[PDB]
Symmetry: C4
Subunit: 33 residues, 4 copies
């Protein structure tokens, strides 16, 4: 097909990459003991 796979597949793919990106940053915490 012209597209990589499907509109639903592409959207979920991007929504997943960012989801783990922003969610990971929020979970991560910087501390200096």
């Amino acid at each position: 097909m012209f597209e990589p796979f499907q509109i639903l597949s592409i959207c979920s793919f991007i929504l997943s990459a960012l989801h783990f990106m922003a969610w990971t940053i929020g979970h991560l915490n910087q501390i200096k003991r």
Copy 2:
């Protein structure tokens, strides 16, 4: 097809929009320093 895509697709779509809406609001916090 008559429907936009599928029952499972439509449900997940709505469940995702709200999921990020309510979840985002809960994560967001208002503070006045």
Copy 3:
């Protein structure tokens, strides 16, 4: 088909129902002022 839809569909369906159930309970908090 014999099954309601598909193995992947059924699994995700159950995993979603519980996901929102346990996740909702954890988010909910009881307080007595």
Copy 4:
């Protein structure tokens, strides 16, 4: 098919297993009263 199902299916499957694993551990807390 040669593969268990599909590349997208396999990836999501693994990403889900770990997602619940690491996420569960983070949620879990050990305390000694």
